[PDB]
Coordinates of C-alpha atoms in Angstrom, one line a residue:
Chain A
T1 CA 0.0 0.0 0.0
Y2 CA 2.9 2.4 0.7
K3 CA 6.4 2.8 -0.7
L4 CA 9.5 4.1 1.1
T5 CA 13.0 4.4 -0.4
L6 CA 16.1 4.4 1.7
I7 CA 19.7 5.2 0.7
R8 CA 23.0 5.3 2.6
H9 CA 25.9 7.5 1.3
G10 CA 28.9 6.1 -0.4
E11 CA 32.4 6.1 1.1
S12 CA 33.7 9.1 3.0
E13 CA 37.2 10.5 3.3
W14 CA 37.6 8.5 6.6
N15 CA 36.3 5.1 5.4
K16 CA 39.5 4.7 3.5
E17 CA 41.5 6.0 6.5
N18 CA 39.8 3.2 8.6
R19 CA 38.6 5.9 11.0
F20 CA 35.6 5.9 13.3
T21 CA 33.4 8.8 12.1
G22 CA 30.0 8.9 13.9
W23 CA 28.8 12.5 14.2
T24 CA 32.1 13.9 12.9
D25 CA 31.1 16.0 10.0
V26 CA 33.4 14.5 7.4
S27 CA 33.3 14.8 3.5
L28 CA 32.4 12.2 1.0
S29 CA 35.4 10.8 -0.9
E30 CA 35.7 11.3 -4.7
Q31 CA 34.5 7.7 -5.0
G32 CA 31.5 8.5 -2.6
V33 CA 30.4 11.2 -5.0
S34 CA 30.6 8.9 -8.0
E35 CA 28.6 6.3 -6.1
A36 CA 25.9 8.9 -5.5
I37 CA 25.9 9.7 -9.2
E38 CA 25.3 6.1 -10.1
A39 CA 22.5 5.7 -7.4
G40 CA 20.8 8.8 -8.9
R41 CA 21.0 7.3 -12.4
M42 CA 19.8 3.9 -11.2
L43 CA 16.8 5.7 -9.7
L44 CA 16.2 7.7 -12.9
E45 CA 16.2 4.5 -15.0
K46 CA 13.7 2.9 -12.6
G47 CA 11.3 5.8 -12.9
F48 CA 11.5 7.3 -9.4
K49 CA 10.5 10.8 -8.5
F50 CA 10.4 12.1 -5.0
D51 CA 8.1 14.7 -3.3
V52 CA 10.4 15.0 -0.2
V53 CA 13.8 13.8 0.9
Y54 CA 14.6 13.3 4.6
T55 CA 18.3 13.5 5.5
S56 CA 20.6 14.2 8.4
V57 CA 22.6 17.3 9.3
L58 CA 25.8 15.6 8.2
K59 CA 27.2 17.0 5.0
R60 CA 28.1 13.6 3.5
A61 CA 24.5 12.6 3.5
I62 CA 23.3 16.0 2.4
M63 CA 25.8 16.0 -0.5
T64 CA 24.7 12.5 -1.4
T65 CA 21.1 13.8 -1.6
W66 CA 22.0 16.8 -3.7
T67 CA 23.9 14.5 -6.1
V68 CA 21.1 12.0 -6.4
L69 CA 18.5 14.8 -7.0
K70 CA 20.7 16.3 -9.8
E71 CA 20.8 12.9 -11.6
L72 CA 17.1 12.5 -11.1
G73 CA 16.5 16.0 -12.6
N74 CA 14.5 16.6 -9.4
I75 CA 16.6 19.3 -7.7
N76 CA 13.4 21.2 -6.9
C77 CA 12.5 18.4 -4.4
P78 CA 12.2 19.7 -0.9
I79 CA 14.9 18.5 1.5
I80 CA 14.5 18.3 5.2
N81 CA 17.6 17.8 7.4
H82 CA 17.4 16.6 11.0
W83 CA 20.0 15.3 13.6
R84 CA 17.7 12.4 14.4
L85 CA 18.8 10.8 11.1
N86 CA 22.5 11.2 12.0
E87 CA 24.8 8.3 12.0
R88 CA 25.2 6.7 15.5
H89 CA 27.5 8.7 17.8
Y90 CA 30.8 6.9 18.6
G91 CA 31.9 8.8 21.7
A92 CA 35.7 8.8 22.4
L93 CA 36.3 6.5 19.4
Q94 CA 35.5 9.4 17.0
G95 CA 38.5 10.6 14.9
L96 CA 40.7 7.6 15.8
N97 CA 42.3 4.8 13.7
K98 CA 41.3 1.2 14.1
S99 CA 45.0 1.1 15.3
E100 CA 44.8 4.2 17.5
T101 CA 41.7 2.8 19.3
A102 CA 43.6 -0.5 19.8
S103 CA 46.4 1.5 21.5
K104 CA 44.5 3.9 23.8
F105 CA 41.6 1.5 24.6
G106 CA 41.2 -2.3 24.7
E107 CA 41.5 -3.7 21.1
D108 CA 38.8 -6.3 22.1
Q109 CA 36.5 -3.9 23.9
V110 CA 36.5 -1.5 21.0
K111 CA 35.2 -4.5 18.9
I112 CA 32.5 -4.8 21.6
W113 CA 31.5 -1.2 21.1
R114 CA 31.0 -1.7 17.3
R115 CA 29.4 -5.1 17.4
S116 CA 27.0 -4.5 20.3
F117 CA 23.4 -3.3 20.6
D118 CA 23.5 -2.0 24.2
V119 CA 27.1 -1.0 25.1
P120 CA 28.3 2.6 24.3
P121 CA 31.9 3.9 23.8
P122 CA 33.4 6.3 26.4
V123 CA 32.0 9.8 26.9
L124 CA 33.4 13.1 25.6
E125 CA 33.9 16.0 28.0
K126 CA 32.1 19.3 27.1
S127 CA 35.5 21.0 26.8
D128 CA 36.7 18.5 24.2
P129 CA 36.2 20.1 20.6
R130 CA 34.6 16.8 19.4
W131 CA 31.5 17.3 21.7
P132 CA 28.5 18.3 19.4
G133 CA 27.7 21.3 21.6
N134 CA 30.7 23.1 20.0
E135 CA 29.5 23.0 16.4
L136 CA 27.3 25.9 15.2
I137 CA 25.1 23.2 13.4
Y138 CA 23.5 22.2 16.8
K139 CA 23.3 25.8 18.1
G140 CA 19.6 26.0 19.1
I141 CA 19.0 22.3 20.0
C142 CA 17.9 21.0 23.4
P143 CA 21.2 20.2 25.1
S144 CA 19.9 16.8 26.4
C145 CA 19.7 15.6 22.8
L146 CA 23.4 16.2 22.0
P147 CA 25.1 12.9 22.9
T148 CA 28.5 12.4 24.5
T149 CA 28.3 8.8 23.3
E150 CA 25.8 6.4 21.7
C151 CA 25.2 2.7 21.4
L152 CA 22.8 1.3 18.7
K153 CA 20.0 1.2 21.3
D154 CA 20.4 5.0 21.8
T155 CA 20.2 5.5 18.1
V156 CA 16.9 3.6 17.5
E157 CA 15.4 5.5 20.4
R158 CA 16.0 8.9 18.9
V159 CA 15.2 7.8 15.3
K160 CA 11.8 6.3 16.4
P161 CA 9.8 9.5 17.1
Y162 CA 11.2 11.1 14.0
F163 CA 9.7 8.3 11.9
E164 CA 6.5 8.5 14.0
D165 CA 5.9 12.3 13.9
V166 CA 7.6 13.4 10.7
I167 CA 8.3 10.7 8.0
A168 CA 5.1 8.6 8.7
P169 CA 2.7 11.5 8.1
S170 CA 4.5 12.3 4.8
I171 CA 4.1 8.6 3.7
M172 CA 0.5 8.6 4.8
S173 CA -0.3 11.8 2.8
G174 CA 0.7 10.0 -0.4
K175 CA 4.1 11.6 -0.9
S176 CA 7.0 9.8 -2.6
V177 CA 9.6 9.8 0.2
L178 CA 13.3 9.1 0.1
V179 CA 15.3 8.8 3.3
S180 CA 19.0 9.7 2.6
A181 CA 21.1 8.9 5.7
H182 CA 23.7 6.6 7.3
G183 CA 24.3 2.9 8.2
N184 CA 23.1 3.0 11.8
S185 CA 20.1 5.4 11.2
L186 CA 18.9 3.2 8.4
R187 CA 19.3 0.0 10.4
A188 CA 17.3 1.8 13.2
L189 CA 14.5 2.4 10.7
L190 CA 14.6 -1.3 9.5
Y191 CA 14.6 -2.5 13.1
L192 CA 11.5 -0.4 13.7
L193 CA 9.6 -1.0 10.4
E194 CA 10.2 -4.8 10.3
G195 CA 9.7 -5.3 14.0
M196 CA 13.1 -6.9 14.7
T197 CA 14.9 -8.2 17.8
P198 CA 18.2 -6.7 19.0
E199 CA 20.1 -9.7 17.7
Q200 CA 18.3 -9.6 14.4
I201 CA 19.4 -6.1 13.5
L202 CA 23.0 -7.0 14.4
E203 CA 22.9 -9.4 11.4
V204 CA 21.9 -6.7 8.9
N205 CA 24.4 -5.0 6.5
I206 CA 23.2 -2.1 4.3
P207 CA 25.4 -1.7 1.2
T208 CA 26.6 1.9 0.4
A209 CA 24.8 4.1 -2.1
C210 CA 22.4 1.3 -3.0
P211 CA 18.7 2.2 -2.9
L212 CA 16.5 0.0 -0.8
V213 CA 12.8 0.0 -1.5
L214 CA 10.3 -0.9 1.4
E215 CA 6.8 -1.8 0.6
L216 CA 4.6 -1.0 3.7
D217 CA 1.3 -2.0 5.4
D218 CA -1.6 0.2 6.3
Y219 CA 0.1 0.0 9.7
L220 CA 3.4 1.1 8.1
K221 CA 5.1 -2.3 8.6
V222 CA 7.4 -3.8 5.9
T223 CA 5.6 -6.4 3.7
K224 CA 8.5 -6.7 1.3
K225 CA 12.0 -5.2 0.6
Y226 CA 14.4 -5.1 -2.3
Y227 CA 17.5 -3.3 -3.6
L228 CA 17.8 -1.5 -7.0
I229 CA 20.7 -3.7 -8.2
Chain B
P1 CA 25.6 48.7 14.5
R2 CA 23.8 51.6 16.3
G3 CA 20.5 52.4 14.5
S4 CA 19.9 49.0 12.9
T5 CA 19.2 45.6 14.7
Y6 CA 19.1 42.9 12.0
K7 CA 21.1 41.8 9.0
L8 CA 19.6 40.2 5.9
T9 CA 21.5 38.9 2.8
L10 CA 20.2 38.7 -0.7
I11 CA 21.6 37.2 -3.9
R12 CA 20.2 36.7 -7.4
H13 CA 21.6 33.8 -9.5
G14 CA 24.2 34.2 -12.2
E15 CA 23.6 33.5 -15.9
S16 CA 21.2 30.9 -16.9
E17 CA 21.0 29.1 -20.3
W18 CA 18.3 31.5 -21.4
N19 CA 20.3 34.6 -20.4
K20 CA 22.9 33.3 -22.9
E21 CA 20.1 32.9 -25.5
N22 CA 18.7 36.3 -24.6
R23 CA 15.2 34.9 -24.0
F24 CA 12.5 36.0 -21.5
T25 CA 12.5 33.3 -18.8
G26 CA 10.1 34.1 -15.9
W27 CA 8.9 30.9 -14.4
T28 CA 10.4 28.7 -17.0
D29 CA 12.6 26.3 -15.1
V30 CA 15.9 26.7 -16.9
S31 CA 19.4 25.6 -15.9
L32 CA 22.3 27.9 -14.9
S33 CA 25.0 28.0 -17.6
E34 CA 28.5 26.8 -16.6
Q35 CA 29.3 30.5 -16.3
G36 CA 26.4 30.9 -13.9
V37 CA 27.7 28.0 -11.8
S38 CA 31.1 29.7 -11.8
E39 CA 29.6 33.0 -10.7
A40 CA 27.8 31.1 -7.8
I41 CA 31.3 29.7 -6.8
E42 CA 32.8 33.2 -6.8
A43 CA 29.9 34.5 -4.6
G44 CA 30.4 31.7 -2.1
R45 CA 34.1 32.4 -1.9
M46 CA 33.4 36.1 -1.4
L47 CA 30.9 35.3 1.5
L48 CA 33.5 32.9 3.1
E49 CA 36.1 35.7 2.9
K50 CA 33.7 38.1 4.6
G51 CA 33.0 35.6 7.4
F52 CA 29.4 34.7 6.6
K53 CA 27.6 31.7 7.9
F54 CA 23.8 31.1 7.5
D55 CA 21.3 29.4 9.7
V56 CA 18.7 29.3 7.0
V57 CA 18.4 30.0 3.3
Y58 CA 15.1 30.8 1.5
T59 CA 15.1 30.1 -2.2
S60 CA 12.5 29.6 -5.0
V61 CA 11.3 26.4 -6.5
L62 CA 13.3 27.1 -9.7
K63 CA 16.4 25.0 -10.2
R64 CA 18.7 27.9 -11.2
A65 CA 18.3 29.6 -7.8
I66 CA 18.3 26.2 -5.9
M67 CA 21.6 25.2 -7.7
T68 CA 23.0 28.6 -6.9
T69 CA 22.1 28.0 -3.3
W70 CA 23.8 24.6 -3.1
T71 CA 26.9 25.9 -5.0
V72 CA 27.2 28.9 -2.6
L73 CA 26.8 26.7 0.5
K74 CA 29.4 24.2 -0.7
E75 CA 31.9 27.1 -1.2
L76 CA 30.9 28.5 2.2
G77 CA 31.5 25.1 4.0
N78 CA 27.9 25.6 5.1
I79 CA 26.3 22.6 3.4
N80 CA 24.4 21.7 6.7
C81 CA 22.4 24.9 6.4
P82 CA 18.6 24.3 6.1
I83 CA 17.2 25.3 2.7
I84 CA 13.6 26.2 2.3
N85 CA 12.2 26.4 -1.3
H86 CA 9.0 28.4 -2.0
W87 CA 7.3 29.5 -5.2
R88 CA 6.6 33.0 -3.7
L89 CA 10.4 33.7 -4.3
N90 CA 10.1 32.8 -8.0
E91 CA 11.1 35.2 -10.7
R92 CA 8.3 37.5 -12.0
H93 CA 6.1 35.6 -14.5
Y94 CA 6.6 36.9 -18.1
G95 CA 3.3 35.5 -19.5
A96 CA 3.3 34.8 -23.3
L97 CA 6.8 36.4 -23.6
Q98 CA 8.3 33.4 -21.8
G99 CA 10.6 31.5 -24.2
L100 CA 10.9 34.2 -26.8
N101 CA 14.0 35.9 -28.4
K102 CA 14.2 39.5 -29.5
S103 CA 13.6 38.2 -33.0
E104 CA 10.7 35.9 -31.8
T105 CA 9.0 38.6 -29.7
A106 CA 9.3 41.3 -32.4
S107 CA 7.6 38.9 -34.8
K108 CA 4.8 37.8 -32.4
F109 CA 4.1 41.2 -30.8
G110 CA 4.8 44.9 -31.3
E111 CA 7.7 47.2 -30.1
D112 CA 5.3 49.6 -28.3
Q113 CA 3.6 47.0 -26.0
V114 CA 6.8 44.9 -25.5
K115 CA 8.7 47.9 -24.0
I116 CA 5.9 48.5 -21.4
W117 CA 5.7 44.8 -20.5
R118 CA 9.4 44.8 -19.6
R119 CA 9.7 48.3 -18.0
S120 CA 6.3 49.1 -16.3
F121 CA 5.3 48.5 -12.7
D122 CA 1.6 47.7 -13.2
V123 CA 1.2 46.6 -16.8
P124 CA 1.7 42.8 -17.4
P125 CA 2.7 40.8 -20.5
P126 CA -0.2 38.9 -22.2
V127 CA -1.8 36.0 -20.4
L128 CA -0.9 32.3 -21.0
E129 CA -3.9 30.2 -21.9
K130 CA -4.2 27.2 -19.5
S131 CA -3.9 24.9 -22.6
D132 CA -0.4 26.4 -23.4
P133 CA 2.3 24.0 -22.3
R134 CA 4.0 27.0 -20.6
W135 CA 1.2 27.4 -18.0
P136 CA 2.5 26.7 -14.4
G137 CA -0.5 24.4 -13.7
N138 CA 1.2 21.9 -16.0
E139 CA 4.3 21.3 -13.8
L140 CA 4.5 18.6 -11.1
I141 CA 6.4 21.0 -8.8
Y142 CA 3.2 23.0 -8.3
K143 CA 0.9 19.9 -8.0
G144 CA -0.5 20.6 -4.5
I145 CA -0.4 24.4 -4.7
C146 CA -3.7 26.4 -4.5
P147 CA -4.6 27.1 -8.2
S148 CA -5.1 30.9 -7.6
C149 CA -1.4 31.2 -6.7
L150 CA -0.3 30.1 -10.2
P151 CA -0.1 33.2 -12.5
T152 CA -0.8 33.3 -16.3
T153 CA 1.3 36.6 -16.3
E154 CA 2.7 39.1 -13.8
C155 CA 3.7 42.7 -13.7
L156 CA 6.1 43.8 -11.0
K157 CA 3.1 44.9 -8.8
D158 CA 1.8 41.3 -8.9
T159 CA 5.2 40.0 -7.8
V160 CA 5.4 42.4 -4.9
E161 CA 1.9 41.4 -3.8
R162 CA 2.8 37.7 -3.7
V163 CA 6.3 38.2 -2.2
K164 CA 5.0 40.4 0.6
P165 CA 3.1 37.8 2.8
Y166 CA 6.1 35.4 2.4
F167 CA 8.4 38.0 3.9
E168 CA 5.7 38.9 6.5
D169 CA 4.9 35.4 7.7
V170 CA 8.0 33.3 7.0
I171 CA 11.2 35.3 6.4
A172 CA 10.4 38.1 9.0
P173 CA 10.0 35.6 11.9
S174 CA 13.3 33.9 11.1
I175 CA 15.1 37.3 11.2
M176 CA 13.4 38.3 14.4
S177 CA 14.4 35.0 15.9
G178 CA 18.1 36.0 15.5
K179 CA 18.8 33.7 12.6
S180 CA 21.4 34.5 10.0
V181 CA 19.3 34.5 6.8
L182 CA 20.2 34.3 3.1
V183 CA 17.6 34.9 0.4
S184 CA 18.7 33.2 -2.9
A185 CA 16.3 34.1 -5.7
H186 CA 15.8 36.2 -8.8
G187 CA 16.0 39.8 -10.2
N188 CA 12.3 40.6 -9.8
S189 CA 11.8 38.7 -6.5
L190 CA 14.6 40.5 -4.9
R191 CA 13.5 43.9 -6.3
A192 CA 10.0 43.1 -4.8
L193 CA 11.7 42.6 -1.5
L194 CA 13.7 45.9 -1.8
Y195 CA 10.5 47.7 -2.8
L196 CA 8.8 46.5 0.4
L197 CA 11.7 46.8 2.9
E198 CA 12.8 50.2 1.7
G199 CA 9.3 51.5 1.3
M200 CA 9.9 52.6 -2.2
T201 CA 7.6 54.3 -4.8
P202 CA 6.8 52.2 -7.9
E203 CA 8.9 54.7 -9.8
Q204 CA 11.9 54.3 -7.4
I205 CA 12.1 50.5 -7.9
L206 CA 11.7 50.6 -11.7
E207 CA 15.2 52.3 -11.8
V208 CA 16.8 49.7 -9.5
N209 CA 19.0 47.0 -11.0
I210 CA 20.5 44.1 -8.9
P211 CA 23.8 42.7 -10.2
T212 CA 23.9 38.9 -10.7
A213 CA 25.7 36.6 -8.1
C214 CA 26.7 39.7 -6.0
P215 CA 25.6 39.4 -2.4
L216 CA 23.6 42.4 -1.2
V217 CA 23.6 43.0 2.6
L218 CA 20.6 44.8 4.1
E219 CA 20.8 46.2 7.6
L220 CA 17.3 46.4 9.1
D221 CA 15.3 48.4 11.7
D222 CA 13.3 47.1 14.7
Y223 CA 10.5 47.6 12.1
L224 CA 12.4 45.5 9.5
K225 CA 12.9 48.5 7.2
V226 CA 16.2 49.2 5.6
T227 CA 18.6 51.5 7.4
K228 CA 21.5 50.9 5.0
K229 CA 22.6 48.5 2.3
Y230 CA 25.8 47.5 0.6
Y231 CA 27.2 44.9 -1.8
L232 CA 30.2 42.8 -0.9
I233 CA 32.1 43.5 -4.2
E234 CA 33.8 48.6 -5.8
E235 CA 33.5 46.4 -8.9

């Protein structure tokens, strides 16, 4: 009855560098841009046209969105950015190498923080530049929202009301909706829309810059899903 | 500074493909040329040099202004800035002149009436018939817009009248909130704003020309009337 399209951005300048990103506002790589261009063209070929795009406040997803819309000849499409679609926050792991985290922290407990549903990385102090309350992007936002760290549980819990109060009404109104976001925000949506267990979402991998189409219920629950590939 | 309380930035886009072809555009949804993209890049760099950062951008629903906005924001390192598109910031509608050259218009119409259509405040170009493919009711971008909003033609007076409530109810509150606001739009949309905010006579604004891709900074009253204005460019 309903149709929702999801897309995660291509590789960033830190994916190659093997660096934990999270809320760090890092650029797409040259390859990440080209991946967006191909996603756009794939969507054009498959006859897609969107009435609204929901994205995060992170430039790599916003640039992905702009690139896809250009290829769709749909740059007039309204875009709404919101922090609730941000990638999962990685706390003290942010900005560090796979090797640098292995040095400062336990090499094994870092792998716990990435592969777990309910265990978050260490907290950032407010004085630390990395803390989101330093960026002008989050200037007028309720302080309690701005994380020092996040686990996957924390991400699903802040994505959920955004779907409920914002994306869901758009869907229900008959709009063609794209959600252009990140790995963890999109998995949060899947977990919610498919009605998954915590262990079930840990088994889910979303490929980069690859449009995922969800067909939905009257109740907005996934009846079927497929990639445009 | 003392005497003003707010700052508002305006920019019209650089050259489009129809500027190059010297055609009347209006609501026709034409692309920027490569030069127009380059001019947007220059504007962004100028703004970055002057220490500008925006909290919101208002633009039209026309791709040349939207692409100008995205280009400027990329150059500003301000990609995260919310962008709100609205038809009320669209270029003035040019009616049956839309799409025509100076060889095409001289053939279809007369030199007397054409001069007035381009220069006057209150005399519009001839009306598009709804059957004409050029009529805005044909475009998917306007699908859910109240039909009375979609013009078959506009004089500058008309443009002012539809821009006014958009400043009043949407842009004004953003300014009064303390937001740093950019308006990225078109020649006649921006002149409409200058007409309103400076309290000009219809004669006063007919002599006003806004240079392309050249940020215009307005300092505003408590009343949101212009105290002073300057471009970022003496060039």
